[PDB]
Amino acid sequence: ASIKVIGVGGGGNNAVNRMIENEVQGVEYIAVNTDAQALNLSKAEVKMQIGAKLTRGLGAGANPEVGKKAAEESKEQIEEALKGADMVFVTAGMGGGTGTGAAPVIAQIAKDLGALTVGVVTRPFTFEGRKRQLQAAGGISAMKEAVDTLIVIPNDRILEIVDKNTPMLEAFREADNVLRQGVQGISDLIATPGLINLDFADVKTIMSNKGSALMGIGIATGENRAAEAAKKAISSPLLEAAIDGAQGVLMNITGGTNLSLYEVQEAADIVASASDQDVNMIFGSVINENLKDEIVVTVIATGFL
Ligand SMILES: Nc1nc2c(ncn2[C@@H]2O[C@H](COP(=O)(O)OP(=O)(O)O)[C@@H](O)[C@H]2O)c(=O)[nH]1
């Protein structure tokens, strides 16, 4: 009932902006940064500047230790801001300073308060270099000590989904959108009950990550749109391990007012059949008027090990 999405650092705050622009519902947004100037560019209702003393608003200089210590200075304000949450999503681009460093501390504060804590983060594009990958690897492992499940999106695989010619700015804009899909794919099912009923317990069921959780997405229009979206999702480059390996699968089928009963059963079957015969599968369905001929299938896969 109280669901918070907390964007952490530049990339995380940009994802939260995307979510706000797509008018994702049922969540309260918090933006967090060590850089006061970038924080001023956030559309989140709540704008939290961490490490005022340590950084004087000037950011974390790509250093995870400064992000970590900024969040420790601001420990009590983060506690305050997260008070009363049943569920907390922590999004960030891993590899920089504020995200890598502060997102785990924020995740752990969420968890200590009793919130169901899901992380949705990206691993950096190879083209950002070896130093970024290494800092990201470090933050990813810290993060999964601090959350109930960590969805890790490998940015390289986005290049296999967007066109050959894509400058950086645009590549990073599609990373905002995959982050948004990871959060929304879950939150949409929980914010409002749904025609398929789906409570917190259903979600806690699959919310058990040792191992990085992975996500697949599939979009389609036309007359076989259901099977084509389902198939694309279980086939997404973002899903770096076959879905048949996962202990847990959450499926979200989203469409417009003409999403059909037969399509929901079709997609549910395609995804279930590609999965292990002993899988714990929970799924839901949501209507989004803004979609017309388009359906979106999202699969979140957990418990690979
Ligand atoms: N989703 C998204 N990711 C970004 C963006 N810019 C950079 N990144 C990624 O996020 C990582 C950290 O960047 P940034 O968030 O600016 O660092 P931070 O503010 O110190 O946490 C980078 O290594 C990139 O892979 C962006 O605008 N959107």
Residue numbers in the entry: 12 to 316
The paper states:
We examined three globular proteins from three phylogenetically disparate sources including: FtsZ, the cell division protein from B. subtilis; NS5B, the RNA-dependent RNA polymerase from Hepatitis C Virus; and P38α, a human protein kinase.
Based on the quality of crystal morphology and initial diffraction screening experiments, we focused on a single condition (30% PEG-200, 100 mM MES pH 6.0, 5% PEG-3000) and harvested crystals that diffracted X-rays to 2.45Å resolution. FtsZ formed orthorhombic crystals and contained two molecules in the asymmetric unit related by a non-crystallographic 2-fold axis. Non-bonded contacts at the NCS dimer interface are formed between the backbone oxygen of Lys 64 and the side chain of Asn 74 as well as Glu 76 and Glu 84. The latter are formed via water mediated contacts. The structure was traced from Ala 12 to Phe 315 of FtsZ for both subunits. Although guanosine diphosphate (GDP) was not added during the purification or crystallization, analysis of the nucleotide binding pocket following refinement revealed prominent difference density consistent with the presence of GDP. GDP forms direct non-bonded contacts with the T1 loop (Gly 21-Gly 22) and T4 loops (Gly 108-Gly 110).
